[PDB]
Amino acid sequence: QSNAMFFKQFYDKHLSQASYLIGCQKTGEAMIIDPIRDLSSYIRVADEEGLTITHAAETHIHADFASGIRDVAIKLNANIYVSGESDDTLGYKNMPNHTHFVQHNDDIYVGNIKLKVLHTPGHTPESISFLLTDEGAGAQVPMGLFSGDFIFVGDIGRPDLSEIGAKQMFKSIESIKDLPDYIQIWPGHGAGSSLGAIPTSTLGYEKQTNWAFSENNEATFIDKLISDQPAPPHHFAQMKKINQFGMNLYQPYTVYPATNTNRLTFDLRSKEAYHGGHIEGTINIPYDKNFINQIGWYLNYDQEINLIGDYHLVSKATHTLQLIGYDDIAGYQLPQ
Amino acid sequence: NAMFFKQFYDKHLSQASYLIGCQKTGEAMIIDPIRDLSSYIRVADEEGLTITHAAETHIHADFASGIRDVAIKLNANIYVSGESDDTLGYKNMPNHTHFVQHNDDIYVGNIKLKVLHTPGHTPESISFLLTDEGAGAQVPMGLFSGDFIFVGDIGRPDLGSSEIGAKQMFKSIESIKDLPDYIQIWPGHGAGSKSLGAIPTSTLGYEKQTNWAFSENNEATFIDKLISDQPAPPHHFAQMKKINQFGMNLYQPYTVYPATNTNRLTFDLRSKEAYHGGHIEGTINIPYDKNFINQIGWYLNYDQEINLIGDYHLVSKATHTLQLIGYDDIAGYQLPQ
């Protein structure tokens, strides 16, 4: 009913990941940026605003969650936009129809909303960022930048599996400084992924408080970017694969009492509960905000697992695991 | 430490399933399971029971059985009637299936179920007579009667073959009179499925006093009263008989997102008043109330994908209910307008 551009951020606490829905006032068209596999929240919000999801875009090939972009194209018959700024080996493969490979300085329109594609390598070689201008409202200046894992609140992305990426990052940071200081920064990840809890920042504020914007010695920049960065959890290589090549469409599935106990098993209860009594061979991964961060070190994508917890707790963990592209929970068992 | 017993009723299907559990061993059985096993599983968990068995009274014509799903997903033993001819009996049964005969005994832990062949509604219909032997009972407690005996009425035979069924029903009623009048009657269907009671349970003695079928002593009169004025079966009944005899895909929930094309049979889930006040052309109003399945069954084409009209949540509920009659092919939805 209101004619102002629609914008809403969606945050997943386990993944520490931010996706966004933008929608055009005039035409009803809408786009999801960096979608997760479960599209239901975006859909319900679009319904409530009278918007139709017709587009989806992605900042880069994610290492820490399973993208829902192919699901958007297939289930919603939407046009999708992904980076074409890659070499022949590490670029997107098996993409559906309606897939547009975008390059630096390309413009994407979502109704009257204009997004300019900026190639911002460093975190990954194909990383792109999207500069939004609300042209439907007559704006002649940009409003904000969907920065993916290029720029975070109070930090910047690390080159994933380094000097080559670090050097790319330094250059991307130098060129992004040219954008107006009043633009908002809409990052792809936040606190828990260090990273700010505040879901958004501004370019000018980052220039004042983000170390990456004040360090102009390339060698010092590279050293600080790469130095003492923890080794990535084991599930990252698998995510890169499923995001580069695609996986099965997302569907919920039943998790009933386990038929075979000889499986890698994770106990979802509190550390206090587990400590108070637990079955042997099971690994305690409490289903709190650190669940994914912890479970990635033990999760084998080529094996079925059982979970220990009550039916409801198990169904929540099951869902969260599907968000990192794991659809193979074989069953569950109650704690004794 | 007493035998566990719990009835589960689906209001759209007007169907009753049960969970019984052994107090000594923890073994439990589901009788006449629907495709979504979650409610039985949740209750079993709460009571410290493990679902190790499931049984079915007959090849249902009004909902999609979850019996095969029990055997495959829970690795439980399943018990179905082996009292059939060579063409209408259960087919393609999965691992862990046991075909039972009249007088067989099934033990769920220390609970004993005696299988009674009670044909009429269908030629293979069986009823399960329960005795709480784990409590030391020397007498039966009740009968899981499926669609043989209801509260206040009895099942109708399917389509000649209608008269043969009528005669089998008369004979089954006569045989069941010998059981104690104090046993409970646990029917397979209730109010809304013929006119069944809302009360979920009866007793043989009370049925003998109030159920017309226990007072009609003449076969010709019994038959005429049974197979006269029988309404036409809804069109989904043949599909149900087929998927219950031969099987269908395992139950899984699925996503129903905004429809890409309007080119399908489309059901509007809103109230009849809302539909009257305003609707899209080319749709069929089937309000999502207790009569939802009874109504949609006339129109549902199992060979086609359909669209629904309603908000996201209303659509998700209707989708699930449709899966209970074995329909897994909703293509998408659209908002009312």
Place this chain on the structure above:
Amino acid sequence: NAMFFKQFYDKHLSQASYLIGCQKTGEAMIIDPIRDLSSYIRVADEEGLTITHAAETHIHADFASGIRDVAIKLNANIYVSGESDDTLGYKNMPNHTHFVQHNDDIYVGNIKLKVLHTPGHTPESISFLLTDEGAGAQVPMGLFSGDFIFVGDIGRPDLLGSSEIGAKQMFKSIESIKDLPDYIQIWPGHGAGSKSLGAIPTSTLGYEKQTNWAFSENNEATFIDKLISDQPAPPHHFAQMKKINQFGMNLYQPYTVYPATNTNRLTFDLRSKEAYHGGHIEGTINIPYDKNFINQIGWYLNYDQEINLIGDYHLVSKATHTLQLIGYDDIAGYQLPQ
């Protein structure tokens, strides 16, 4: 057409209440209502019924009756036992109360309930024998037995030889009920968890005659002895329950339980005993929020003081509601477990 029936079971109270409804008139009755009436109301609405009546089998010792709430909030007629002496009977009753006695008949639309005085558990205990006259039935269908007859056992003389007097009345009450048709159902007021109550929600008189000890013991002395002997001490909230059910308490309303602004001498930790062992705040009492929650907290609950709870917001909201079912509305706040 022609009669609705539905049992409602609360797992913490191990208590069974029922809703019956006449489909001819739309009138409905709640038997042994708890304080929160929402479930009955929702079911009545789904069935096209209007709750116009409520009845209670006796003055309950193990939960807070919602009978007075039904009377005041739904302007319904309520029926309670008038089989009492001058001091232990209902007091302060609202003007839509009807006191019933042995052999009176209550009609819910066309449904007929005959009241039977079945003393023993309490001196005023009554049972309701239902006949579905709306469907032309000329025989009874079942008995709402309250705490007189349970599945596989019978109630004990409410500890108000004083128990000996109740046990003798129980013996005569059992004797008097044997005359009813063996095919009637038995719809008890409590089930598994309250000493030896069946999980199955209903039974039949003939089945109980075969399996329930009380029906086979015909020697009065022996019966009395087995009844009153080795009976566990009741938790302390039973006396509070008898008082609020006889005199009435405030109407039920939900209320907010936010983070505690101060500590309280009675602070109950709702987590599992294993979780409590693994770490807890001192000065607290562990009462896990499982099926034995009420049976445990009853020993410690002081109705004249405010209490605190330990657990997450949602766990706390659930326990708060369960405590309101035993007439406790004074939780002051909560704190997260540390």
Place this chain on the structure above:
Amino acid sequence: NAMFFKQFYDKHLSQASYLIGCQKTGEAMIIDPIRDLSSYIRVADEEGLTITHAAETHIHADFASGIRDVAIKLNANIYVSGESDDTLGYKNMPNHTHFVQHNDDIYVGNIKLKVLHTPGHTPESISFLLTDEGAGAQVPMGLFSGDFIFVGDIGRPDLLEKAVKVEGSSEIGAKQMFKSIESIKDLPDYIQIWPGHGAGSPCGKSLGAIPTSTLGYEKQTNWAFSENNEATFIDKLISDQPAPPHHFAQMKKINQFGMNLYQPYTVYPATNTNRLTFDLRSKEAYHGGHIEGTINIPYDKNFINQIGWYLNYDQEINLIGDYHLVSKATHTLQLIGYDDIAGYQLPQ
């Protein structure tokens, strides 16, 4: 890192409230709280924060303030404007309430908030300038602007009751607004703007759906920042503005004088049909069949916007709908300070 920040938006109220928290000390503050505090509490619990503070930007006209509930239920320190005259300020406030003035600093753990008096929408309106000092920041991050600055527009002076009317009221409020805008321009252009209201209300058609903006962006696109002629500014601000719905006048009084603590309550079937009654179903359901005398107020995003024109705070009211829908509507009405739903009837 050193600071938690979360916005809470009520779609029916078109209202934005915020929770900020100091990760170093655990202290946390709610800005412009609604009456139901559960959402703030749940989020604080998840983050390991303790709600120790609450502040309010001004005397609200469009929802019922939870600020007194915060002080009473949570024993928190509360901060409200003392920039009012001796008659139009807050009354009946809990003991120890802090009446803040221009330039006062409020610390939430290591987070610093500077109170800025920004009159215009109301004479007492204040805005809060946040600096993340726990993270060592030397520059402000954002401004909690209430109804002073919106995304794409600015507040209009709240109207006065006919009985206590003053001839140049809309205009002297407009002048204050022009000066408040003038003063805010000196802040860094990269600060965020965190408004108290956004899209959804006919009384703010220009308000952004985006929950936040920046000062520099508003300087480029918000008319209020480019109009430097005072007379033209005043005229545009106060000319041809729609009449506010009737509940606004009542909300202002409830907020100025306080009301009973928030508590959920039961709404059960009612047989009394001699009450003002609202039918919560869709307009098409209502058209398909309804009872005469009832007023259709569909329980959609526009529920409050529409019901404000008919709600009588002095009467008990019935609702028509199913049990669950009635309970949702009942809760939403409590968010505008109405606790007197007497019961419901199912639709016929």
